[PDB]
Design a protein around this ligand. Sequence first.
Ligand SMILES: COCCOc1ccc2cc1OCC(=O)N(C)CCCNCc1c[nH]c3ncnc(c13)N2
Length: 259
Amino acid sequence: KKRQWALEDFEIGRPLGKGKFGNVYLAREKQSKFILALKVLFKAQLEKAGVEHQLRREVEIQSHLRHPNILRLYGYFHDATRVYLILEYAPLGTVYRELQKLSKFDEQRTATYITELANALSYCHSKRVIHRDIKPENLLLGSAGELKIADFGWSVHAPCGTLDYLPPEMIEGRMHDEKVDLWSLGVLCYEFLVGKPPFEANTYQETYKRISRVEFTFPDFVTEGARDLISRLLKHNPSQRPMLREVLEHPWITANSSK
Ligand SMILES: COCCOc1ccc2cc1OCC(=O)N(C)CCCNCc1c[nH]c3ncnc(c13)N2
């Protein structure tokens, strides 16, 4: 990097969101006036949870990712008690909150989100990078409503968390592959259109069985092109899922996506 960062370089503004390990704040770099987000994580929490060194890896990965639909990490630093991530600010907030406000997305908004996700994942696959738990809460909106993936690139542990967004291979304790991200598109496409993710339940263990079985239904208003895309992405067998190019070339995506 070009700079040594300290907290005194930044004027902190209001909280943008509150996470398990800490909060995200609006901030402004004092000398340049550059507005950004600062995500502040407590070291003690990271340690106790056993994710401290995992974060380090994901930050290094993230620091090398440049793409209009991937939230930019500009730098990072620390002090005795906290880690600080210096991020691109996404002024229209999370897709989660947009989904709550609208209850569900129309086909053009969904198709365009899926296209933008798929471009970002395709850029990440060209670097051998994958994701885990891509969820509306981790997807952000830029100044012109463009999707930004905030969820860092995933890095594994040595060889309780929510199951909604995980593919069969992750949960059955099996080998995994970039094709996890194809499963993620399927889950997200469904959730964008329907308003809830497709394997939801009141219990984790029930959600587990639903995913393993790929057991889900479509409400009557979900159209055939959409049912086609979602069903090809939610294949139990990773090899039967399409490639990212096939998602971008799918007639329902091309009929509804903004070009
Ligand atoms: C290990 O860390 C990986 C990076 O993860 C994140 C980077 C940036 C994020 C959120 C990230 O994770 C999710 C999280 O911590 N939440 C509290 C969810 C709230 C979303 N924030 C709302 C928000 C609004 N405008 C923003 N501009 C930039 N970043 C933002 C936000 N938040």
